[PDB]
Amino acid sequence: PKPYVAINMAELKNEPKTFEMFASVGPKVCMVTARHPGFVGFQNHIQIGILPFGNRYGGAKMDMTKESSTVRVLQYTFWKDWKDHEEMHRQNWSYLFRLCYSCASQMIWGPWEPIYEIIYANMPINTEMTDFTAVVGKKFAEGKPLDIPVISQPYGKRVVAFAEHSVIPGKEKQFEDAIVRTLEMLKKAPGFLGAMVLKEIGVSGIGSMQFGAKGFHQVLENPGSLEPDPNNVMYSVPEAKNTPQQYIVHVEWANTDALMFGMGRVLLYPELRQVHDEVLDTLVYGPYIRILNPMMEGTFWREYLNE
Amino acid sequence: PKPYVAINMAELKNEPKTFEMFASVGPKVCMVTARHPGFVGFQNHIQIGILPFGNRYGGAKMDMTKESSTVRVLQYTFWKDWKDHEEMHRQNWSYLFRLCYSCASQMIWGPWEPIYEIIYANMPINTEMTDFTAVVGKKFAEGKPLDIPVISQPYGKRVVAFAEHSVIPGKEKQFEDAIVRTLEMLKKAPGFLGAMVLKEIGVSGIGSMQFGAKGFHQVLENPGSLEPDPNNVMYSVPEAKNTPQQYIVHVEWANTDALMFGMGRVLLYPELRQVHDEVLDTLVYGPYIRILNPMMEGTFWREYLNE
Amino acid sequence: PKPYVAINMAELKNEPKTFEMFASVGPKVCMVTARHPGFVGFQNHIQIGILPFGNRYGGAKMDMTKESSTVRVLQYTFWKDWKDHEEMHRQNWSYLFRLCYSCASQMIWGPWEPIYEIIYANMPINTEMTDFTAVVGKKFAEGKPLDIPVISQPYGKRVVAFAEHSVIPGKEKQFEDAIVRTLEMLKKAPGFLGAMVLKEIGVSGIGSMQFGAKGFHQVLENPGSLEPDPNNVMYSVPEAKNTPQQYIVHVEWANTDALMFGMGRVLLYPELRQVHDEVLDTLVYGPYIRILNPMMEGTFWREYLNE
Ligand SMILES: [Fe+3]
Ligand SMILES: [Fe+3]
Ligand SMILES: [Fe+3]
């Protein structure tokens, strides 16, 4: 089936201590989200660059993790129903707040946690390169030679193109069908691993430390081992979803060369170019493409989506 | 009267070459905007820090211009009517595009140019500290001892607190009156120079290099001395504005100590605290406070607003 | 009117980490005291020297913050009624104990928090030097040219002379009137900003971590995220107060030259010398003069005292 994705965004300092606490406080949070029965998986990325579009963004590069001061992190979290997210965040509030507040000594911006729904998916299951001679055997056994996937190495061995679009009111489903068609054509590139399209449906306030007046002061004067009341969030998830339709396109690639030259096929390939020029005529903003590196993942989520 | 403010936002590399081209291409653009008769002034800022709210943003500091990789710039531009902006941007298109594209070799993000209207203003006119013995003389001459302002040094000798809020649908005018009242109380701080409140009304597409399909390719493959057609912008200014109403609060201070301890009066002062806790109960996001430094300005704009 | 001042005294290590936690845990505590309605303001000082009285204290100097191992800090806190202090300290006990115990890794002595009442006050309101052309305008408007004050820069731009006296039983009101008269004469110095006289009325036990037997062990074996019972304080505020009446004289000066040569006027000026020699004939101990530097302040307290 299709899960929803809550994405937790933050910007942190780029010190070694930041990565130490990524390695320490990272897994623990993941263990508190698994207490709910609707949780299906997770994936954690760090930004490593921006695709420069030639010289449209002349000061950006596909590798900037060396000469930089701030590192931006995005956590994907996959749910069967988006109310599972809102009922897990507030039943494990004591653990979650203190864990995520141990992280706040290094933050420059955020967190901001919006909620998206999957309107399209082409994601294969991940495997190692020692895990593929026993996968094609099972497929040729059951007489299914047309459903053997591409090898998709887990645990930080592939890149993600993270494209942000915002769409004019009155062009939404046009955008949706055009982008689906262009991905159908684009899956032909040498290195394409999978893709999905996400449509923003709302914003979570408890996951973004966004309280009313009483909770804001409790957040400001927190020594570390106390919590605000989680019911002091003034709005609900669908109450304030942004009017320009915000969409994410998440494409996977084997390496940054494949990323650079495959995402550029929509510019160089005349068929794909004419197909993609109906995406452009609906955008308020975009596309803005980030290059993400997946540090860790609950790979089993891809099982649920393909069951 | 009240002008509108178009704000041009960008993120650039933090090299010395960036500041060289700030000093060179900066004034020239300003000379092309002055060709329209509705242009009333301008102000240019660079971000120098983030107010950490104690340790809410633990990795931020009021001075980060040293240990950083990217510098964010915001240009204010003041218009009598927001259609003056849309008719100046496209009658000087040849000069403007090439000037602003000479800048694109150093950009990491943007530009994004939204359009705001002034709903409140308390801005005094700027003066040097050698310019104040001839100002009180004219005021005491005309028997007006209650309208002598505070000294507000121009050309980079004061700080700006740039607070971003977004408001829940259904709480807008409540936010407006509450924030006006809290600024009325807050003008008592030791170092307060002035303040204004801006309400986002739309987004300009020509000023953000946001074209359709035909113009996007012309932007991508531009050697430098060519222009896209400026009428290939798919949307108009009011067509796409955000669901949470985006407000800016722009407060001026003599120095960063006054900024740190005056913007904190809303937290420490019980009267001001209880007045300000009606602002907080309407926010989808915020407040997020940046510290800006004004490198240059068309100070005469403050004349028009106070005439 | 007149508030009471609770003064929190401590001695800490003089490392950079001490100042880091001053900048971090400092504001947060200040935000927890503002929850009571009787709280009117605050002021925080660090000791930077001792006035050597020629060579009476030959090893002391007006600047010792460089070659030193321990830094002594004094917090002033201003209350309408001294029971406001005792009812705020124990209703916010959970926040306050953990905040002030995060500080205990660097302490050499204290804290000791005695409670004083204001018997005399001459404190003007603080202003920046860009804030004074709009202050005299309002005063000349309302025909009040004799109540325009001296400029008193906030946020660490002035020095404090902190003089400690103790008075023989049977000489108290003699001391009081003599010191008031000598301050009336002394306000003539070139650089005098203001002064106040405080008379010690008692000691707070909850604010000095002074519990009985049950609470002392809870303080000793505290991991950090627990609290003693705040009602295990064996004595009340007026129960214990020193037999020699403890007085503080708090004088403000523009700079340490003005401090050195203005506090010495009582020695060099024959009129002031003969007036001040009735202060000396009542002292058990003193005067001992410290030089304080105000790092931060809730300046609005000076409004309440002058309303
Ligand atoms: Fe969440
Ligand atoms: Fe513009
Ligand atoms: Fe106390």
Coordinates of N, CA and C in Angstrom, one line a residue, chain A residues 15-211:
Chain A
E15 N 30.2 20.6 13.2 CA 31.3 20.2 14.1 C 31.3 18.7 14.2
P16 N 32.5 18.1 14.6 CA 32.5 16.7 14.9 C 31.5 16.3 16.1
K17 N 31.3 17.1 17.1 CA 30.4 16.8 18.1 C 29.0 16.6 17.6
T18 N 28.6 17.3 16.6 CA 27.3 17.1 15.9 C 27.2 15.7 15.4
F19 N 28.2 15.2 14.8 CA 28.1 13.8 14.3 C 28.2 12.8 15.4
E20 N 28.9 13.1 16.5 CA 28.9 12.2 17.7 C 27.5 12.1 18.2
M21 N 26.8 13.2 18.4 CA 25.5 13.1 18.9 C 24.5 12.6 17.8
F22 N 24.8 12.7 16.6 CA 24.0 12.0 15.5 C 24.1 10.5 15.7
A23 N 25.3 10.0 16.0 CA 25.5 8.5 16.2 C 24.9 8.1 17.5
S24 N 24.9 8.9 18.5 CA 24.3 8.5 19.8 C 22.8 8.7 19.9
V25 N 22.3 9.9 19.8 CA 20.9 10.1 20.0 C 20.1 9.7 18.8
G26 N 20.7 9.3 17.7 CA 19.9 8.9 16.5 C 19.1 7.7 16.7
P27 N 19.8 6.6 17.0 CA 19.1 5.3 17.2 C 18.0 5.3 18.3
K28 N 18.3 6.0 19.4 CA 17.4 6.0 20.5 C 16.0 6.5 20.2
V29 N 16.0 7.6 19.5 CA 14.7 8.2 19.0 C 13.9 7.2 18.2
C30 N 14.7 6.5 17.3 CA 14.1 5.5 16.4 C 13.5 4.3 17.1
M31 N 14.0 4.1 18.4 CA 13.4 3.0 19.2 C 12.2 3.5 19.9
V32 N 12.0 4.8 20.0 CA 10.7 5.2 20.7 C 9.6 5.3 19.7
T33 N 9.9 5.6 18.4 CA 8.9 5.6 17.4 C 8.3 4.2 17.1
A34 N 9.1 3.2 17.3 CA 8.7 1.8 17.0 C 7.7 1.3 18.0
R35 N 7.5 2.0 19.1 CA 6.4 1.6 20.0 C 5.0 1.7 19.5
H36 N 4.8 2.4 18.4 CA 3.5 2.5 17.9 C 3.3 1.3 16.8
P37 N 2.1 0.8 16.7 CA 1.9 -0.3 15.7 C 1.7 0.2 14.3
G38 N 1.5 1.5 14.0 CA 1.4 1.9 12.7 C 2.7 2.3 12.0
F39 N 3.8 2.4 12.8 CA 5.1 2.8 12.2 C 5.6 1.7 11.3
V40 N 6.0 2.1 10.1 CA 6.4 1.1 9.1 C 7.9 1.3 8.7
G41 N 8.5 2.4 8.9 CA 9.9 2.5 8.6 C 10.4 3.9 8.8
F42 N 11.7 4.1 8.3 CA 12.3 5.4 8.5 C 13.5 5.5 7.6
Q43 N 14.0 6.7 7.3 CA 15.2 7.0 6.5 C 15.8 8.3 6.9
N44 N 17.1 8.4 7.1 CA 17.7 9.6 7.5 C 18.8 10.1 6.5
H45 N 18.7 11.3 6.2 CA 19.6 11.9 5.2 C 20.4 13.1 5.7
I46 N 21.5 13.3 5.2 CA 22.2 14.6 5.4 C 22.4 15.2 4.0
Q47 N 22.3 16.5 3.9 CA 22.6 17.2 2.6 C 24.1 17.3 2.4
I48 N 24.5 17.0 1.2 CA 25.9 17.0 0.8 C 26.1 18.0 -0.4
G49 N 25.1 18.6 -1.0 CA 25.3 19.5 -2.1 C 24.1 20.0 -2.7
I50 N 24.2 20.8 -3.7 CA 23.1 21.3 -4.5 C 23.5 21.2 -6.0
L51 N 22.6 20.8 -6.8 CA 22.8 20.6 -8.2 C 22.9 22.0 -8.9
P52 N 24.0 22.4 -9.5 CA 24.2 23.8 -9.9 C 23.5 24.2 -11.1
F53 N 22.8 23.3 -11.9 CA 22.1 23.6 -13.1 C 23.1 24.4 -14.1
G54 N 24.3 23.9 -14.2 CA 25.2 24.6 -15.0 C 25.9 25.7 -14.2
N55 N 25.5 27.0 -14.3 CA 25.9 28.1 -13.5 C 24.7 28.9 -13.0
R56 N 23.5 28.3 -13.0 CA 22.4 28.9 -12.4 C 22.6 29.2 -10.9
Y57 N 23.2 28.2 -10.2 CA 23.6 28.4 -8.8 C 25.1 28.2 -8.9
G58 N 25.9 29.3 -9.2 CA 27.3 29.2 -9.5 C 28.1 28.8 -8.3
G59 N 27.7 29.2 -7.1 CA 28.5 28.9 -5.9 C 28.1 27.6 -5.2
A60 N 27.4 26.8 -5.9 CA 27.0 25.5 -5.3 C 27.7 24.4 -6.0
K61 N 27.8 23.2 -5.4 CA 28.5 22.1 -6.0 C 27.9 20.8 -5.4
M62 N 28.1 19.7 -6.2 CA 27.6 18.4 -5.7 C 28.3 17.9 -4.5
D63 N 29.4 18.5 -4.1 CA 30.1 18.1 -2.8 C 30.5 19.4 -2.1
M64 N 29.8 19.7 -1.0 CA 30.1 20.8 -0.2 C 30.3 20.5 1.3
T65 N 30.3 19.2 1.7 CA 30.4 18.8 3.1 C 31.7 19.1 3.7
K66 N 32.7 19.5 2.9 CA 34.0 19.9 3.4 C 34.1 21.4 3.8
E67 N 33.9 22.2 2.8 CA 34.0 23.7 3.1 C 32.6 24.2 3.4
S68 N 32.1 24.0 4.6 CA 30.8 24.5 5.0 C 30.7 24.6 6.5
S69 N 29.7 25.3 7.0 CA 29.6 25.6 8.4 C 28.3 25.0 9.0
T70 N 27.3 24.8 8.2 CA 26.0 24.2 8.7 C 25.6 22.9 7.9
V71 N 25.1 21.9 8.6 CA 24.7 20.7 7.9 C 23.2 20.6 8.1
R72 N 22.4 20.4 7.1 CA 21.0 20.2 7.1 C 20.6 18.8 7.1
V73 N 19.7 18.4 8.0 CA 19.3 17.0 8.1 C 17.8 16.9 7.9
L74 N 17.4 15.8 7.2 CA 16.0 15.5 6.9 C 15.7 14.1 7.3
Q75 N 14.8 13.8 8.2 CA 14.3 12.5 8.5 C 13.0 12.2 7.9
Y76 N 13.0 11.1 7.1 CA 11.7 10.6 6.6 C 11.2 9.6 7.7
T77 N 9.9 9.6 7.9 CA 9.2 8.6 8.8 C 7.9 8.2 8.1
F78 N 7.7 6.9 8.0 CA 6.7 6.3 7.2 C 5.6 5.7 8.1
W79 N 4.3 6.1 7.9 CA 3.2 5.8 8.7 C 2.1 5.2 7.8
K80 N 1.3 4.3 8.4 CA 0.1 3.8 7.7 C -1.0 4.8 7.6
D81 N -1.1 5.6 8.6 CA -2.2 6.6 8.7 C -1.6 7.8 9.4
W82 N -1.8 9.0 8.9 CA -1.1 10.1 9.5 C -1.5 10.5 10.9
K83 N -2.6 9.9 11.4 CA -3.0 10.0 12.8 C -2.2 9.1 13.7
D84 N -1.5 8.1 13.2 CA -0.6 7.3 13.9 C 0.5 8.1 14.4
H85 N 1.0 9.1 13.5 CA 2.1 10.0 13.9 C 1.7 10.9 15.0
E86 N 0.5 11.4 15.0 CA 0.0 12.4 16.0 C -0.3 11.7 17.3
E87 N -0.6 10.4 17.3 CA -0.9 9.7 18.5 C 0.3 9.0 19.1
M88 N 1.4 8.8 18.3 CA 2.7 8.4 18.8 C 3.5 9.5 19.4
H89 N 3.5 10.7 18.8 CA 4.3 11.8 19.3 C 3.9 12.2 20.7
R90 N 2.6 12.0 21.0 CA 2.1 12.5 22.3 C 1.9 11.4 23.4
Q91 N 2.0 10.2 23.0 CA 2.1 9.1 24.1 C 3.5 8.8 24.5
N92 N 4.5 9.1 23.7 CA 5.9 9.0 24.1 C 6.5 10.3 24.3
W93 N 5.8 11.3 24.9 CA 6.2 12.7 24.9 C 7.4 12.9 25.8
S94 N 7.4 12.2 26.9 CA 8.5 12.3 27.9 C 9.8 11.9 27.3
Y95 N 9.9 10.8 26.7 CA 11.1 10.3 26.0 C 11.5 11.2 24.9
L96 N 10.5 11.5 24.0 CA 10.8 12.2 22.8 C 11.3 13.6 23.0
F97 N 10.7 14.3 23.9 CA 11.1 15.7 24.1 C 12.5 15.8 24.6
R98 N 12.9 15.0 25.6 CA 14.2 15.1 26.2 C 15.3 14.6 25.2
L99 N 15.0 13.5 24.4 CA 15.9 13.1 23.4 C 16.1 14.2 22.4
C100 N 15.1 14.7 21.8 CA 15.2 15.7 20.8 C 15.7 17.1 21.3
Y101 N 15.6 17.3 22.6 CA 16.2 18.5 23.2 C 17.6 18.4 23.6
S102 N 18.1 17.2 23.8 CA 19.6 17.0 23.9 C 20.3 17.5 22.6
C103 N 19.6 17.5 21.5 CA 20.1 17.9 20.2 C 20.1 19.4 20.0
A104 N 19.5 20.2 20.8 CA 19.2 21.6 20.5 C 20.4 22.5 20.8
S105 N 21.5 21.9 21.4 CA 22.7 22.7 21.6 C 23.4 23.0 20.4
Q106 N 23.1 22.4 19.2 CA 23.8 22.5 18.0 C 23.0 23.0 16.8
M107 N 21.8 23.5 17.1 CA 20.8 23.8 16.0 C 20.9 25.2 15.6
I108 N 20.8 25.5 14.3 CA 20.8 26.8 13.8 C 19.4 27.2 13.3
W109 N 18.5 26.2 13.0 CA 17.2 26.5 12.4 C 16.4 25.2 12.6
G110 N 15.1 25.4 12.7 CA 14.2 24.3 12.8 C 14.0 23.8 14.3
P111 N 13.4 22.6 14.5 CA 12.9 21.7 13.4 C 11.6 22.1 12.9
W112 N 11.3 21.6 11.7 CA 10.0 21.9 11.0 C 9.5 20.5 10.5
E113 N 8.4 20.1 10.9 CA 8.0 18.8 10.5 C 6.7 18.8 9.7
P114 N 6.7 19.0 8.4 CA 5.5 18.8 7.6 C 5.1 17.4 7.3
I115 N 3.9 17.2 6.8 CA 3.3 15.8 6.6 C 2.9 15.7 5.1
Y116 N 3.3 14.7 4.4 CA 3.1 14.5 3.0 C 2.5 13.1 2.8
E117 N 1.7 13.0 1.7 CA 1.2 11.7 1.2 C 1.8 11.3 -0.1
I118 N 2.0 10.0 -0.2 CA 2.6 9.4 -1.4 C 1.5 9.2 -2.5
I119 N 1.7 9.9 -3.6 CA 0.8 9.8 -4.8 C 1.4 9.0 -5.9
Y120 N 2.6 8.4 -5.8 CA 3.3 7.7 -6.8 C 4.5 7.0 -6.2
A121 N 4.8 5.8 -6.6 CA 5.9 5.1 -6.0 C 6.4 4.1 -7.0
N122 N 7.8 4.0 -7.0 CA 8.4 3.1 -7.9 C 9.7 2.5 -7.2
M123 N 9.6 2.3 -5.9 CA 10.7 2.0 -5.1 C 11.0 0.5 -5.0
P124 N 12.2 0.1 -5.4 CA 12.5 -1.3 -5.2 C 13.0 -1.6 -3.8
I125 N 13.1 -2.9 -3.5 CA 13.7 -3.2 -2.2 C 15.2 -3.2 -2.3
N126 N 15.9 -2.9 -1.2 CA 17.3 -2.7 -1.2 C 18.0 -4.1 -1.0
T127 N 19.2 -4.2 -1.6 CA 19.9 -5.5 -1.5 C 21.4 -5.1 -1.6
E128 N 22.2 -6.0 -0.9 CA 23.7 -5.9 -1.1 C 24.1 -6.6 -2.4
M129 N 25.3 -6.3 -2.9 CA 25.8 -7.0 -4.1 C 26.2 -8.5 -3.8
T130 N 26.2 -8.9 -2.6 CA 26.3 -10.3 -2.3 C 24.9 -11.0 -2.0
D131 N 23.8 -10.2 -2.2 CA 22.5 -10.6 -2.0 C 21.6 -10.8 -3.2
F132 N 22.3 -10.9 -4.4 CA 21.5 -10.8 -5.6 C 21.5 -12.2 -6.4
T133 N 22.4 -13.1 -6.1 CA 22.3 -14.4 -6.7 C 21.3 -15.3 -6.1
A134 N 20.8 -14.9 -4.9 CA 19.7 -15.7 -4.3 C 18.4 -15.0 -4.4
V135 N 18.3 -13.8 -5.1 CA 17.1 -13.1 -5.4 C 16.6 -13.5 -6.8
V136 N 17.5 -13.6 -7.8 CA 17.0 -14.0 -9.1 C 16.7 -15.4 -9.2
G137 N 17.3 -16.2 -8.3 CA 16.9 -17.6 -8.2 C 15.5 -17.8 -7.8
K138 N 15.0 -17.1 -6.8 CA 13.6 -17.2 -6.4 C 12.6 -16.7 -7.4
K139 N 13.1 -15.7 -8.2 CA 12.2 -15.1 -9.2 C 12.1 -16.1 -10.4
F140 N 13.2 -16.6 -10.9 CA 13.2 -17.6 -11.9 C 12.5 -18.9 -11.5
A141 N 12.5 -19.2 -10.2 CA 11.8 -20.4 -9.7 C 10.3 -20.3 -9.9
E142 N 9.7 -19.1 -9.5 CA 8.3 -18.9 -9.6 C 7.9 -18.3 -11.0
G143 N 8.8 -18.5 -12.0 CA 8.4 -18.1 -13.3 C 8.1 -16.6 -13.5
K144 N 8.9 -15.7 -12.8 CA 8.7 -14.3 -12.8 C 10.0 -13.6 -13.2
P145 N 10.4 -13.7 -14.4 CA 11.6 -13.1 -14.8 C 11.5 -11.6 -15.1
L146 N 10.3 -11.0 -15.2 CA 10.1 -9.6 -15.5 C 9.9 -8.8 -14.2
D147 N 10.1 -9.3 -13.0 CA 9.9 -8.5 -11.8 C 11.2 -8.6 -11.0
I148 N 12.3 -8.9 -11.6 CA 13.6 -8.8 -10.8 C 14.1 -7.4 -10.9
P149 N 14.4 -6.7 -9.7 CA 14.7 -5.3 -9.7 C 16.2 -5.0 -10.0
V150 N 16.5 -3.7 -9.8 CA 17.9 -3.2 -9.9 C 18.5 -3.3 -8.5
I151 N 19.8 -3.5 -8.4 CA 20.5 -3.6 -7.2 C 20.6 -2.2 -6.6
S152 N 20.1 -2.1 -5.3 CA 20.1 -0.8 -4.6 C 20.7 -0.9 -3.2
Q153 N 22.0 -0.6 -3.2 CA 22.8 -0.8 -2.0 C 22.3 0.0 -0.8
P154 N 22.1 -0.5 0.4 CA 21.7 0.3 1.5 C 22.8 0.9 2.3
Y155 N 22.5 1.7 3.3 CA 23.4 2.2 4.3 C 24.4 3.1 3.7
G156 N 24.0 4.1 3.0 CA 24.9 5.1 2.5 C 25.8 4.7 1.4
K157 N 25.1 4.2 0.3 CA 25.9 3.9 -0.9 C 25.2 4.3 -2.2
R158 N 24.3 5.3 -2.1 CA 23.6 5.8 -3.2 C 23.2 7.3 -2.9
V159 N 22.9 8.1 -3.9 CA 22.6 9.5 -3.7 C 21.1 9.7 -4.0
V160 N 20.5 10.7 -3.4 CA 19.1 11.1 -3.6 C 19.1 12.5 -4.2
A161 N 18.3 12.7 -5.2 CA 17.9 14.0 -5.7 C 16.6 14.3 -5.1
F162 N 16.5 15.5 -4.4 CA 15.4 15.9 -3.6 C 14.9 17.2 -4.2
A163 N 13.9 17.1 -5.1 CA 13.5 18.3 -5.9 C 12.3 18.9 -5.3
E164 N 12.3 20.2 -5.0 CA 11.2 20.9 -4.4 C 10.5 21.7 -5.5
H165 N 9.1 21.6 -5.6 CA 8.3 22.4 -6.5 C 7.1 23.0 -5.7
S166 N 6.7 24.1 -6.2 CA 5.4 24.6 -5.7 C 4.6 25.1 -6.9
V167 N 3.3 24.8 -6.9 CA 2.4 24.8 -8.1 C 1.3 25.8 -7.9
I168 N 1.0 26.5 -8.9 CA 0.0 27.6 -9.0 C -1.4 27.0 -8.7
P169 N -2.2 27.7 -7.9 CA -3.6 27.2 -7.7 C -4.3 27.2 -9.0
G170 N -4.9 26.0 -9.3 CA -5.5 25.7 -10.6 C -4.7 24.9 -11.6
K171 N -3.6 24.4 -11.2 CA -2.7 23.6 -12.1 C -2.3 22.3 -11.5
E172 N -3.0 21.8 -10.4 CA -2.4 20.8 -9.5 C -2.4 19.4 -10.2
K173 N -3.6 18.9 -10.6 CA -3.6 17.6 -11.2 C -2.9 17.6 -12.6
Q174 N -2.9 18.7 -13.3 CA -2.1 18.8 -14.5 C -0.6 18.5 -14.1
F175 N -0.1 19.2 -13.1 CA 1.2 18.9 -12.6 C 1.4 17.4 -12.3
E176 N 0.4 16.8 -11.6 CA 0.5 15.4 -11.1 C 0.7 14.5 -12.3
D177 N -0.2 14.6 -13.3 CA -0.1 13.7 -14.4 C 1.1 13.9 -15.2
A178 N 1.5 15.2 -15.4 CA 2.7 15.5 -16.2 C 4.0 14.9 -15.5
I179 N 4.1 15.1 -14.2 CA 5.3 14.6 -13.5 C 5.3 13.1 -13.5
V180 N 4.1 12.4 -13.4 CA 4.1 11.0 -13.5 C 4.6 10.5 -14.8
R181 N 4.1 11.1 -15.9 CA 4.6 10.8 -17.2 C 6.1 11.0 -17.4
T182 N 6.6 12.1 -16.9 CA 8.0 12.3 -17.1 C 8.9 11.4 -16.3
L183 N 8.4 10.9 -15.1 CA 9.2 9.9 -14.4 C 9.1 8.6 -15.2
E184 N 7.9 8.3 -15.8 CA 7.8 7.0 -16.6 C 8.8 7.0 -17.7
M185 N 9.0 8.2 -18.3 CA 10.1 8.2 -19.4 C 11.5 8.2 -18.8
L186 N 11.6 8.9 -17.6 CA 13.0 9.0 -17.0 C 13.5 7.8 -16.4
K187 N 12.7 6.8 -16.1 CA 13.3 5.6 -15.5 C 14.2 4.8 -16.4
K188 N 14.5 5.4 -17.6 CA 15.4 4.8 -18.6 C 16.9 5.1 -18.4
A189 N 17.2 6.0 -17.4 CA 18.6 6.5 -17.3 C 19.5 5.4 -16.8
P190 N 20.8 5.5 -17.2 CA 21.8 4.5 -16.7 C 22.2 4.8 -15.2
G191 N 21.4 4.2 -14.3 CA 21.7 4.4 -12.9 C 20.5 4.7 -12.0
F192 N 19.4 4.8 -12.7 CA 18.1 5.1 -12.0 C 17.7 3.9 -11.1
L193 N 17.5 4.2 -9.8 CA 17.1 3.1 -8.9 C 15.7 3.1 -8.5
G194 N 15.1 4.3 -8.4 CA 13.7 4.4 -8.0 C 13.3 5.8 -7.8
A195 N 12.0 6.1 -7.7 CA 11.5 7.4 -7.5 C 10.1 7.4 -6.8
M196 N 9.8 8.5 -6.1 CA 8.5 8.7 -5.5 C 8.1 10.2 -5.5
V197 N 6.8 10.5 -5.5 CA 6.3 11.8 -5.5 C 5.5 12.0 -4.3
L198 N 5.7 13.1 -3.6 CA 5.0 13.4 -2.3 C 4.3 14.7 -2.5
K199 N 3.1 14.8 -1.9 CA 2.2 16.0 -1.9 C 2.0 16.4 -0.5
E200 N 2.3 17.7 -0.2 CA 2.2 18.1 1.2 C 0.8 18.3 1.6
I201 N 0.4 17.6 2.7 CA -1.0 17.7 3.2 C -1.1 18.5 4.4
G202 N -0.1 18.7 5.2 CA -0.2 19.5 6.4 C 1.1 19.7 7.1
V203 N 1.0 20.2 8.4 CA 2.1 20.5 9.2 C 1.8 20.0 10.6
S204 N 2.7 19.3 11.3 CA 2.6 18.9 12.6 C 3.2 19.9 13.6
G205 N 2.5 20.3 14.6 CA 3.0 21.3 15.5 C 3.7 20.8 16.7
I206 N 3.3 19.6 17.2 CA 4.0 19.0 18.3 C 5.4 18.5 17.9
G207 N 5.5 18.1 16.6 CA 6.8 17.7 16.2 C 7.8 18.8 15.8
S208 N 7.3 20.0 15.8 CA 8.1 21.2 15.4 C 8.2 22.1 16.6
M209 N 8.0 21.7 17.8 CA 8.1 22.5 19.0 C 7.3 23.8 18.9
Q210 N 6.1 23.7 18.4 CA 5.3 24.9 18.1 C 4.1 24.8 19.1
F211 N 4.2 25.4 20.2 CA 3.1 25.5 21.2 C 2.5 26.8 21.3

